[PDB]
mmCIF file with all atom_site columns, C-alpha atoms and ligand atoms in Angstrom:
data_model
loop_
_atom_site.group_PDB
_atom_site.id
_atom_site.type_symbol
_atom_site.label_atom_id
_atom_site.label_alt_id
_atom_site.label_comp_id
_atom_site.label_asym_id
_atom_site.label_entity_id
_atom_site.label_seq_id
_atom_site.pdbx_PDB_ins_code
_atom_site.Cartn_x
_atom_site.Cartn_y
_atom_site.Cartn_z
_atom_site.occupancy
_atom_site.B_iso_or_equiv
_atom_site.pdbx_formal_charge
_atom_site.auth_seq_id
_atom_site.auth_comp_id
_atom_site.auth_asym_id
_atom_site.auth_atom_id
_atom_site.pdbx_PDB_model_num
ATOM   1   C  CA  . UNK A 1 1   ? 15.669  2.291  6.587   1.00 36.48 ? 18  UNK A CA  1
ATOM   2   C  CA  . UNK A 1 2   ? 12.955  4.548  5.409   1.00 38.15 ? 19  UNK A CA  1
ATOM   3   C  CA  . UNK A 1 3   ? 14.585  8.110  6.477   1.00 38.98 ? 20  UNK A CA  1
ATOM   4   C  CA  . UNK A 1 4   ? 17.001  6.531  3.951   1.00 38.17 ? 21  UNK A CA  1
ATOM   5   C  CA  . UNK A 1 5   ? 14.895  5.641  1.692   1.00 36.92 ? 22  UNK A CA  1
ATOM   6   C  CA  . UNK A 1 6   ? 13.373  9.304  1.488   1.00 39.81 ? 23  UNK A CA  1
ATOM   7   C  CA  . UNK A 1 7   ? 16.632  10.350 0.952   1.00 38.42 ? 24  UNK A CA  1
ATOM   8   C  CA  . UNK A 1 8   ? 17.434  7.756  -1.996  1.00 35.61 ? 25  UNK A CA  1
ATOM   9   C  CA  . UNK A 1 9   ? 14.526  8.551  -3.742  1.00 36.85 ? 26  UNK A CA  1
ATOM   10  C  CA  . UNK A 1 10  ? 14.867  12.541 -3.450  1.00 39.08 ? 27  UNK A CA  1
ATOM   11  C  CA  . UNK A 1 11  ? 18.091  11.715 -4.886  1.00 40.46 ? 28  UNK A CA  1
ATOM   12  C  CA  . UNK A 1 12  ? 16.604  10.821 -8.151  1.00 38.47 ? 29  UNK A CA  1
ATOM   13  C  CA  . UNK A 1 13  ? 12.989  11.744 -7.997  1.00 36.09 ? 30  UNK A CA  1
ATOM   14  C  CA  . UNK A 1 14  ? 11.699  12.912 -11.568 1.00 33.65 ? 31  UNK A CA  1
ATOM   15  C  CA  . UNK A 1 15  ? 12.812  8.754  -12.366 1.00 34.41 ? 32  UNK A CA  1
ATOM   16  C  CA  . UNK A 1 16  ? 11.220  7.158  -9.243  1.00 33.11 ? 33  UNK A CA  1
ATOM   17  C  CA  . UNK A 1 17  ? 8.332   9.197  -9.236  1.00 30.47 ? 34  UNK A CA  1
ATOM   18  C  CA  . UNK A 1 18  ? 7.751   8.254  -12.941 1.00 27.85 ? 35  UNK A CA  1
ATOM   19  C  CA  . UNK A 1 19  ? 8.402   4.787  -13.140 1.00 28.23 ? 36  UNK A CA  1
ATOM   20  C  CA  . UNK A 1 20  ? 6.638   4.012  -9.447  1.00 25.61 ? 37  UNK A CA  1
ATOM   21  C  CA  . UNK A 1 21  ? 2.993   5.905  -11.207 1.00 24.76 ? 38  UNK A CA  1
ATOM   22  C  CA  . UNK A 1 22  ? 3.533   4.062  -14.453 1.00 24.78 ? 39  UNK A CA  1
ATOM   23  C  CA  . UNK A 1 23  ? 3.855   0.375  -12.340 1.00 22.83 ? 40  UNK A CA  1
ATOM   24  C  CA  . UNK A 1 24  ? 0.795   1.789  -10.095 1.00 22.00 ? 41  UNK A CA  1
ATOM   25  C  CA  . UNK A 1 25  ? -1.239  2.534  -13.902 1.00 23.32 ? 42  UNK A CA  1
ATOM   26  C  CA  . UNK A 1 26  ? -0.219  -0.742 -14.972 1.00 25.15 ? 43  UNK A CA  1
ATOM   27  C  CA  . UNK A 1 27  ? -0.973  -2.456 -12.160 1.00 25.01 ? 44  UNK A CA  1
ATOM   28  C  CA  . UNK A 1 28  ? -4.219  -1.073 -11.648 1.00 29.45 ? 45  UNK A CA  1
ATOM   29  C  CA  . UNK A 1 29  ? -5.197  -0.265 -15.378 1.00 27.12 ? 46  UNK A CA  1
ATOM   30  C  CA  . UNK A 1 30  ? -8.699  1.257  -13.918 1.00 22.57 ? 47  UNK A CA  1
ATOM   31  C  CA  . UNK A 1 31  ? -7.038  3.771  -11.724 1.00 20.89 ? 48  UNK A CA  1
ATOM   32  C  CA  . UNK A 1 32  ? -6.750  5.615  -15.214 1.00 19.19 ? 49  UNK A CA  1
ATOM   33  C  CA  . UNK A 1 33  ? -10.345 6.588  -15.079 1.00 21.40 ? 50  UNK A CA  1
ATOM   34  C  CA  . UNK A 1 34  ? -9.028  9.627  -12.636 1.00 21.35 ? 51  UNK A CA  1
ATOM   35  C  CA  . UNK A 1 35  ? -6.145  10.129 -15.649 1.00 18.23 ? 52  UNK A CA  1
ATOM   36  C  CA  . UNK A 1 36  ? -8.070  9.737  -18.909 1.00 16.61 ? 53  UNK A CA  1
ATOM   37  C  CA  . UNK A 1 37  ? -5.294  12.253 -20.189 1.00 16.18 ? 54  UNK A CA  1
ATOM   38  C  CA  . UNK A 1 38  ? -3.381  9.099  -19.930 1.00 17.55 ? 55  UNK A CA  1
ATOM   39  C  CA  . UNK A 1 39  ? -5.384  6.110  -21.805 1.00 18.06 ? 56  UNK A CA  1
ATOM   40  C  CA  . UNK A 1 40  ? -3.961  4.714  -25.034 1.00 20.86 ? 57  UNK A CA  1
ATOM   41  C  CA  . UNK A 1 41  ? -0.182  6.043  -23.603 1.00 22.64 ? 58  UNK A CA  1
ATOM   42  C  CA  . UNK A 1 42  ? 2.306   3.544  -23.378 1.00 18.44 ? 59  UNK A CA  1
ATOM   43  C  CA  . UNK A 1 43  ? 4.900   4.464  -20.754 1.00 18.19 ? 60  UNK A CA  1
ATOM   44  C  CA  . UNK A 1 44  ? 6.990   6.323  -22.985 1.00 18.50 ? 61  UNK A CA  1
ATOM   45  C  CA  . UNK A 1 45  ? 4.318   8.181  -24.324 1.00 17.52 ? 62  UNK A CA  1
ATOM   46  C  CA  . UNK A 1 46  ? 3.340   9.365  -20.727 1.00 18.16 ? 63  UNK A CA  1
ATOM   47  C  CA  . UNK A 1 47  ? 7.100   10.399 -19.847 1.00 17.79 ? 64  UNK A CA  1
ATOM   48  C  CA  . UNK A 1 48  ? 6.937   13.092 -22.967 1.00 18.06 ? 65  UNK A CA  1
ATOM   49  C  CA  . UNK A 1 49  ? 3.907   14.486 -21.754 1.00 18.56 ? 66  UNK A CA  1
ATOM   50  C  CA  . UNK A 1 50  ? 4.535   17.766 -19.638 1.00 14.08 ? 67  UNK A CA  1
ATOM   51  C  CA  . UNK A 1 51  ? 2.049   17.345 -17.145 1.00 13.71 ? 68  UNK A CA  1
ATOM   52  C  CA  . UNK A 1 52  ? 2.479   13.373 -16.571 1.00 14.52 ? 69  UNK A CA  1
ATOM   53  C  CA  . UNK A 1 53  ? 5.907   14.280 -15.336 1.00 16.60 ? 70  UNK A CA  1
ATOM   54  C  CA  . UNK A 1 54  ? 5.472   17.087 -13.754 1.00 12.60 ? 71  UNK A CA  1
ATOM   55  C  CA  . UNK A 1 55  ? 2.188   16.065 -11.790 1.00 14.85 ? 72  UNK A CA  1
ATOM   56  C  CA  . UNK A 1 56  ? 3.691   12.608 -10.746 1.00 15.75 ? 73  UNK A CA  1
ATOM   57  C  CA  . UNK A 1 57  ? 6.960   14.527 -9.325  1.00 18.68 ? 74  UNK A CA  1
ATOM   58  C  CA  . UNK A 1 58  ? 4.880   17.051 -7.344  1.00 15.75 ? 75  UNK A CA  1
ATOM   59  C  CA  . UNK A 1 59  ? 2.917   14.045 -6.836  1.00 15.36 ? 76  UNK A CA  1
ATOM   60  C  CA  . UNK A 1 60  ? 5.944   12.268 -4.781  1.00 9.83  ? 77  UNK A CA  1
ATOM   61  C  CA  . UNK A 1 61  ? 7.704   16.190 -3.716  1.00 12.53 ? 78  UNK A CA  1
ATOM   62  C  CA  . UNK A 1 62  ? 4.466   16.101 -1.627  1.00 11.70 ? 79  UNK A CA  1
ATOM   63  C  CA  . UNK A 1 63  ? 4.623   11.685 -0.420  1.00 8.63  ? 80  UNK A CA  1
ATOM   64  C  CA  . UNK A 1 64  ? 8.454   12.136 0.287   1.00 10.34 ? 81  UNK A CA  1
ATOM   65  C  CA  . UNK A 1 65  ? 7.628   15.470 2.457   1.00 8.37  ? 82  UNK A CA  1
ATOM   66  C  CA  . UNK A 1 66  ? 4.199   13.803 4.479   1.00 8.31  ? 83  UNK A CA  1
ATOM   67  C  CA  . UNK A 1 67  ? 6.785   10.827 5.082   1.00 7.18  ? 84  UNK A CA  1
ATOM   68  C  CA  . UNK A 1 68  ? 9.787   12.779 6.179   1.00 5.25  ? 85  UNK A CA  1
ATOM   69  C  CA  . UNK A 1 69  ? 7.130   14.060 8.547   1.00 3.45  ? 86  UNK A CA  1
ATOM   70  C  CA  . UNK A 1 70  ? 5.983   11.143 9.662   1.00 3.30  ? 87  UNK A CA  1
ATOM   71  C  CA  . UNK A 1 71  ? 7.010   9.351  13.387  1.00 5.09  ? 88  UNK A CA  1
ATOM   72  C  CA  . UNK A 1 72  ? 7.309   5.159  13.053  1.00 6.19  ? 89  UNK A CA  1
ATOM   73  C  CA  . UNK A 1 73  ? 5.936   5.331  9.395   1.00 8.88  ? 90  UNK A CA  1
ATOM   74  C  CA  . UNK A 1 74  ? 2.536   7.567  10.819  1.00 11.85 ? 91  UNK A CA  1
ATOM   75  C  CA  . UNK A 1 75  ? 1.665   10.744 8.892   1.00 14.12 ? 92  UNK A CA  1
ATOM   76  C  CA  . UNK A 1 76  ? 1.279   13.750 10.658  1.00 16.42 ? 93  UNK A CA  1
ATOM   77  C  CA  . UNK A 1 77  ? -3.192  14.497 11.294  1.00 13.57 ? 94  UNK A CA  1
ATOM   78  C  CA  . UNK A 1 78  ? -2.175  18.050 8.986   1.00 13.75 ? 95  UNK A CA  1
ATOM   79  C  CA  . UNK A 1 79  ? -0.321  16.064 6.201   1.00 12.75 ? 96  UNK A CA  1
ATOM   80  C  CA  . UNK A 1 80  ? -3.395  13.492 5.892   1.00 17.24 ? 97  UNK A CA  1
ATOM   81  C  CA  . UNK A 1 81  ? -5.940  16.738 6.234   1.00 16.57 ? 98  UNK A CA  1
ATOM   82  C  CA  . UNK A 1 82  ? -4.538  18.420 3.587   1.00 16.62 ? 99  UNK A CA  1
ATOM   83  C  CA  . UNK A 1 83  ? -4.454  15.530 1.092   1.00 14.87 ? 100 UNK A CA  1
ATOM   84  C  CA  . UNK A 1 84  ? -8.141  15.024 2.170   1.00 17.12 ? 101 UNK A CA  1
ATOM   85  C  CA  . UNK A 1 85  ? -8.985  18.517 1.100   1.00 17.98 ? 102 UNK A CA  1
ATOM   86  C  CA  . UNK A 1 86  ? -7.289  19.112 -2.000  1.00 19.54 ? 103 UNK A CA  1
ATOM   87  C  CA  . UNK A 1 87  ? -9.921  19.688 -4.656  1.00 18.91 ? 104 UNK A CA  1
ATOM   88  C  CA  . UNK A 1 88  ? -7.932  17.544 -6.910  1.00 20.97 ? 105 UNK A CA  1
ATOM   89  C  CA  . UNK A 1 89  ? -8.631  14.248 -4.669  1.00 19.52 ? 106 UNK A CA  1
ATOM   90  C  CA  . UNK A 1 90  ? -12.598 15.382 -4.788  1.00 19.90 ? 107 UNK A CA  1
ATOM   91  C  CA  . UNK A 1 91  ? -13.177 12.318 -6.290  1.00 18.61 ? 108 UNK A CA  1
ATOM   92  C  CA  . UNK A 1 92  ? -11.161 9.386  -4.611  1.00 16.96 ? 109 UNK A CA  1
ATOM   93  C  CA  . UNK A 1 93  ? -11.669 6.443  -1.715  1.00 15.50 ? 110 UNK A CA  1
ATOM   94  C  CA  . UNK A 1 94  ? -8.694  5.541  0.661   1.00 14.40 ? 111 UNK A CA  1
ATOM   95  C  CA  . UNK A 1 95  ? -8.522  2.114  -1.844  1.00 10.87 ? 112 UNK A CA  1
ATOM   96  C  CA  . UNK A 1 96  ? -7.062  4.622  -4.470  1.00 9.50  ? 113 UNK A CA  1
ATOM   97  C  CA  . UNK A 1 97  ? -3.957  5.075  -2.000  1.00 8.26  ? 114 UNK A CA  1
ATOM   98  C  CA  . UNK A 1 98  ? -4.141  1.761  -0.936  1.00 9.22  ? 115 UNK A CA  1
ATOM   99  C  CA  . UNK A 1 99  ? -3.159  0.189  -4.744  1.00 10.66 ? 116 UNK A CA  1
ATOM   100 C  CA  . UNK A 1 100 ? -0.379  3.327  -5.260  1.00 10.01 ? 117 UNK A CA  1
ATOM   101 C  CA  . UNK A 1 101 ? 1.257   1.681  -1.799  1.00 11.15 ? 118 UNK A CA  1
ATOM   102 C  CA  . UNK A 1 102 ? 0.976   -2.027 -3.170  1.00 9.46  ? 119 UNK A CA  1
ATOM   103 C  CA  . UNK A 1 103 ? 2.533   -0.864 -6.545  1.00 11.26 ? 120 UNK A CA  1
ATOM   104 C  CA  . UNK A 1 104 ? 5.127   1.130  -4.513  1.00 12.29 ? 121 UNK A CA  1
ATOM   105 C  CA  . UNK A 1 105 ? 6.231   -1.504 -1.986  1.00 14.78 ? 122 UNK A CA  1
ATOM   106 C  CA  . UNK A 1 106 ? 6.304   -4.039 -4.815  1.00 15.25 ? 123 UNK A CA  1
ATOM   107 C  CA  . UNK A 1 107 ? 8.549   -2.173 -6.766  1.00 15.70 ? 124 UNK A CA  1
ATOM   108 C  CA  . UNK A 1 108 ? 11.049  -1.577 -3.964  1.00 13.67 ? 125 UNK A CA  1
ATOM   109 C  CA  . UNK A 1 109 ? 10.765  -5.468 -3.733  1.00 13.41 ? 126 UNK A CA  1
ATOM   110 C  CA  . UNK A 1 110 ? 11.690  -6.147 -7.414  1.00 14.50 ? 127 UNK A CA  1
ATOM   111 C  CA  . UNK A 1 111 ? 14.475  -3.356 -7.210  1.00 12.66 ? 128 UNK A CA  1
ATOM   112 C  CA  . UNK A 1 112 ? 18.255  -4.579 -6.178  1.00 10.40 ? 129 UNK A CA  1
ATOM   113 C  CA  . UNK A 1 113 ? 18.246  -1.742 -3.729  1.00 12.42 ? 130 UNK A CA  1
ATOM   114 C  CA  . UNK A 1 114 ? 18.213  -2.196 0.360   1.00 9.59  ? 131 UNK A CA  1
ATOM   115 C  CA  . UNK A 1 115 ? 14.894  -0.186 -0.108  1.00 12.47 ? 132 UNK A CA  1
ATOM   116 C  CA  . UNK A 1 116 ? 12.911  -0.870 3.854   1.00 17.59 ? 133 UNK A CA  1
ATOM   117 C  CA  . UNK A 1 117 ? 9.600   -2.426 1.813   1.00 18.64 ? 134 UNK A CA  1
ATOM   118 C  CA  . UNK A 1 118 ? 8.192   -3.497 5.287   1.00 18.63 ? 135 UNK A CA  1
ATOM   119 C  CA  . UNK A 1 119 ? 8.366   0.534  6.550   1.00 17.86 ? 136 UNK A CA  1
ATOM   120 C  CA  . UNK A 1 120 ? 6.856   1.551  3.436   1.00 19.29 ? 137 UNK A CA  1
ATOM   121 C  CA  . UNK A 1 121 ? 4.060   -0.656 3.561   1.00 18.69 ? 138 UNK A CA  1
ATOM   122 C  CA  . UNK A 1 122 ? 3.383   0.354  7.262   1.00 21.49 ? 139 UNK A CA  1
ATOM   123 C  CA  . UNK A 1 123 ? 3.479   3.856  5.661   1.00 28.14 ? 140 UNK A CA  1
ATOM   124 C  CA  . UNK A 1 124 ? 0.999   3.104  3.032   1.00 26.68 ? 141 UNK A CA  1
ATOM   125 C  CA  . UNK A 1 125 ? -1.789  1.678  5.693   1.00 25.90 ? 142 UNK A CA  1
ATOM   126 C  CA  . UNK A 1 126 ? -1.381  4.530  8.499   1.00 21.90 ? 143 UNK A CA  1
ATOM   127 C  CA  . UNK A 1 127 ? -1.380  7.116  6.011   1.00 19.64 ? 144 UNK A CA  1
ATOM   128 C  CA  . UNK A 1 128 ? -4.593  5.039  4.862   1.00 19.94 ? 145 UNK A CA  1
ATOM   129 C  CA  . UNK A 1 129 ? -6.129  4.943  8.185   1.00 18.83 ? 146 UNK A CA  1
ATOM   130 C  CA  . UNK A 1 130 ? -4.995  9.017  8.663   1.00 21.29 ? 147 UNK A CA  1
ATOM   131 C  CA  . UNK A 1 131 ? -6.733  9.469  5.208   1.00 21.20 ? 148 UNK A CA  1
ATOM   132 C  CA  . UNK A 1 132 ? -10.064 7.767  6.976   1.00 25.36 ? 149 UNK A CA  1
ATOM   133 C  CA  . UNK A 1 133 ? -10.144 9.339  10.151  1.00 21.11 ? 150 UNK A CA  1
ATOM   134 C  CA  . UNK A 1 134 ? -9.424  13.084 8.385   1.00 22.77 ? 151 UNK A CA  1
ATOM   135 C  CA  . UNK A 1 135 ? -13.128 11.852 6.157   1.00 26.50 ? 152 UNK A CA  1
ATOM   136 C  CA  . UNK A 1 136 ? -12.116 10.330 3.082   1.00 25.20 ? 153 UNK A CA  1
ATOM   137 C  CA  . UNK A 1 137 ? -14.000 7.257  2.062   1.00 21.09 ? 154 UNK A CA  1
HETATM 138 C  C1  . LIG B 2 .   ? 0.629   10.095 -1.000  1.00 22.13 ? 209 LIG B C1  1
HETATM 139 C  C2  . LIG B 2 .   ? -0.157  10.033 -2.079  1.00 22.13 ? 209 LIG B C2  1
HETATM 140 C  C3  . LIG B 2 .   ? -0.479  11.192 -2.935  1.00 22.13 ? 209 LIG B C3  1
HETATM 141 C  C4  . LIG B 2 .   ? 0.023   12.461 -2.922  1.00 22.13 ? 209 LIG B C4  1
HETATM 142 C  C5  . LIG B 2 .   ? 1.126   12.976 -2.015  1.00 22.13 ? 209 LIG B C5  1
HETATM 143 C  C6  . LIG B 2 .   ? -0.675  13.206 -3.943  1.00 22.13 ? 209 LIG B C6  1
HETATM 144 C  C7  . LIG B 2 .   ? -0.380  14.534 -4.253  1.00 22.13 ? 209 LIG B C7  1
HETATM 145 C  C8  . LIG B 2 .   ? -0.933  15.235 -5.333  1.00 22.13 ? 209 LIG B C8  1
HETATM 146 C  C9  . LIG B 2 .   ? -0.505  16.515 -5.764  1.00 22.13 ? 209 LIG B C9  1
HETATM 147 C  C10 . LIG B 2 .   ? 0.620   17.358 -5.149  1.00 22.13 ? 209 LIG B C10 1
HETATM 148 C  C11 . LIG B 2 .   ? -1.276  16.868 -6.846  1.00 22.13 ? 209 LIG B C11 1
HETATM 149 C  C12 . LIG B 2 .   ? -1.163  18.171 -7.626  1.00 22.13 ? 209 LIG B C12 1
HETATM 150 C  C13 . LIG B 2 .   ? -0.329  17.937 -8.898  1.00 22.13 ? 209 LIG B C13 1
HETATM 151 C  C14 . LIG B 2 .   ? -0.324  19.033 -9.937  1.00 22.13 ? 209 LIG B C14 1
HETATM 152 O  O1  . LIG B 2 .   ? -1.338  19.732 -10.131 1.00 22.13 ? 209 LIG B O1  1
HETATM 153 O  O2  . LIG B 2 .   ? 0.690   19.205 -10.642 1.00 22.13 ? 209 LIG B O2  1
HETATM 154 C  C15 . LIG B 2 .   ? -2.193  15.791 -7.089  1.00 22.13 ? 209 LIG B C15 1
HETATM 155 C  C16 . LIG B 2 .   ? -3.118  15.821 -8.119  1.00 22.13 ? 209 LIG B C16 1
HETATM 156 C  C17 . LIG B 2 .   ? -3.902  14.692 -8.339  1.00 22.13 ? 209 LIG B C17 1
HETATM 157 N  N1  . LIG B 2 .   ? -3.918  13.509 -7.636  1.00 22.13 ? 209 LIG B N1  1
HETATM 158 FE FE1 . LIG B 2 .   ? -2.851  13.012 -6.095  1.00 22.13 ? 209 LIG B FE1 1
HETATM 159 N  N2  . LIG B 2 .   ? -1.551  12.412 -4.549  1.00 22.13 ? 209 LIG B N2  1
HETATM 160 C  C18 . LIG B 2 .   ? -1.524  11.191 -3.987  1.00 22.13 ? 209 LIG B C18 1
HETATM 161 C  C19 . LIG B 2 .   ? -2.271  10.055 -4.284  1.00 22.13 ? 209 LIG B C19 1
HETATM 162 C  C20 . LIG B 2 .   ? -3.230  10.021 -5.285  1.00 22.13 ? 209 LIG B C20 1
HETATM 163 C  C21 . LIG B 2 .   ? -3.919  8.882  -5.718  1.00 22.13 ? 209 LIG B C21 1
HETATM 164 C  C22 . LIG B 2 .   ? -3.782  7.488  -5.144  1.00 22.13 ? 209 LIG B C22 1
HETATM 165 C  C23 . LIG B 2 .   ? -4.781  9.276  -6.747  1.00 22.13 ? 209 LIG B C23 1
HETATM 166 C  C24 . LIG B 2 .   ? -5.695  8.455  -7.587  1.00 22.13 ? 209 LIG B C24 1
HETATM 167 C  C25 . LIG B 2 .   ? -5.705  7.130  -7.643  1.00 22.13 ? 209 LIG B C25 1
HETATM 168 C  C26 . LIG B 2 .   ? -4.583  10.671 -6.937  1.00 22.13 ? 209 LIG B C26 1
HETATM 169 C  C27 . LIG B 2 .   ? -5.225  11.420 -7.904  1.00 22.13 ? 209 LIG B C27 1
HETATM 170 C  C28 . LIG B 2 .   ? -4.841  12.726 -8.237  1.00 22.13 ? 209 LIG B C28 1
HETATM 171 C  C29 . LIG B 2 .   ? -5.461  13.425 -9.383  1.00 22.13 ? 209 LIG B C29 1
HETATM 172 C  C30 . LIG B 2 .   ? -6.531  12.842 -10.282 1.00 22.13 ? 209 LIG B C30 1
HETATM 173 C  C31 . LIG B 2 .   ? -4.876  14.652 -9.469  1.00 22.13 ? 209 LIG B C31 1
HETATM 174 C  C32 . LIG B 2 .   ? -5.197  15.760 -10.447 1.00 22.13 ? 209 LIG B C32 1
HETATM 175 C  C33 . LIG B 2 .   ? -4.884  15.406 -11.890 1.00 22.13 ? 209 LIG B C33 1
HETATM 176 C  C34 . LIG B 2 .   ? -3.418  15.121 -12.011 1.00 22.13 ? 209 LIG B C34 1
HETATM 177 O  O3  . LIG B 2 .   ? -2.628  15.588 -11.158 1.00 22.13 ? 209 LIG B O3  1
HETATM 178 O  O4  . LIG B 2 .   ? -3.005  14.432 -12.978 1.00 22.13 ? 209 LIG B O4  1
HETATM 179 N  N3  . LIG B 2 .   ? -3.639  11.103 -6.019  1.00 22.13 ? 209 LIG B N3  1
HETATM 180 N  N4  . LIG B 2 .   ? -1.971  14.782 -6.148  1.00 22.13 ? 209 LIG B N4  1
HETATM 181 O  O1  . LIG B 2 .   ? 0.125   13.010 -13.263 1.00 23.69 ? 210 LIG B O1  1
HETATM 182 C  C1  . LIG B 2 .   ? 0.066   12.481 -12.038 1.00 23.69 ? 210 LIG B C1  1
HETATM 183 C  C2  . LIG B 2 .   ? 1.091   11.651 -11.556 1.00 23.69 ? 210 LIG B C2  1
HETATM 184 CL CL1 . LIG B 2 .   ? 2.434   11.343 -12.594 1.00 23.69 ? 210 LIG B CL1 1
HETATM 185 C  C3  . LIG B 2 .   ? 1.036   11.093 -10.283 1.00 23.69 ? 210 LIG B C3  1
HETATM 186 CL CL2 . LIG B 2 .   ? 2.325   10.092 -9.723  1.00 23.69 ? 210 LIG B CL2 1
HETATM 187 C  C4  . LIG B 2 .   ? -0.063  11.346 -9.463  1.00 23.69 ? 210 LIG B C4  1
HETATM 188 CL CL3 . LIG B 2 .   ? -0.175  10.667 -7.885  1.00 23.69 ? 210 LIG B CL3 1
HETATM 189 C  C5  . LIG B 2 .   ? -1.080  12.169 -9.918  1.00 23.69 ? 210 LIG B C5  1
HETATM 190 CL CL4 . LIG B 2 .   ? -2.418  12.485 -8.883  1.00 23.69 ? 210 LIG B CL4 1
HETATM 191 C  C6  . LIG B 2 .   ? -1.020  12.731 -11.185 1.00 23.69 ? 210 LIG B C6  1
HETATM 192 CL CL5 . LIG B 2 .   ? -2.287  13.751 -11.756 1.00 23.69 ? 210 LIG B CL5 1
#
């Protein structure tokens, strides 16, 4: 299930992280208006550039500890307040976490693995709906 699942990822996170941001930025091409570091990058480009890999695994580091903390796939009030505040997310709407969660659940569904795509989904809309009531837009 998805304690699991944390636990699979963690177990090769500097990959996951990676290639789960790259299908979210191909996905959702736009998205790379917040990441204009990243236009004209193919994906191997991106993985030889220091800060794509390190953001995106600090990036997930911080997902894979919000969802270890969650209860029935619902974030903790603090986890979604602090992702509110940080002055790197100034700029974004709850529909910039909604398209990382499509491209996330959709990649568990195209992987072989027994990933729980139904808990992660859940995850992705309460941690959307935590995002809301903590004042993101
Ligand atoms: C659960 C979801 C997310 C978590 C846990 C998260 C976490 C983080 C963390 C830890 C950083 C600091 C990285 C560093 O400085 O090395 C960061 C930076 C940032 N995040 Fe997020 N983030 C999430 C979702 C998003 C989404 C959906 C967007 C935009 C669509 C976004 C945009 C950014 C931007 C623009 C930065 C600063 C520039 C950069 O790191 O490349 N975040 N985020
Ligand atoms: O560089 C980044 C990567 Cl790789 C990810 Cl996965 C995320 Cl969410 C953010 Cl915000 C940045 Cl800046």
């Amino acid at each position: 299930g998805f304690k699991q699942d944390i636990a699979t990822l963690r177990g090769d996170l500097r990959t996951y992280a990676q290639d789960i941001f790259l299908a979210f930025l191909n996905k959702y091409p736009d998205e790379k208006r917040n990441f204009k570091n990243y236009v004209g990058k193919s994906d191997q480009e991106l993985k030889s550039m220091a800060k794509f890999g390190d953001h995106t695994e600090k990036v997930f580091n911080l997902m894979m500890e919000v969802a270890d903390r969650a209860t029935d796939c619902v974030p903790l009030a603090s986890d979604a307040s602090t992702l509110v505040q940080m002055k790197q997310h100034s700029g974004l709407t709850t529909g910039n976490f909604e398209k990382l969660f499509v491209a996330l659940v959709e990649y568990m569904r195209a992987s072989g693995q027994s990933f729980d795509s139904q808990s992660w989904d859940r995850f992705g809309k309460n941690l959307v709906s935590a995002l809301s009531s903590a004042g993101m837009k």
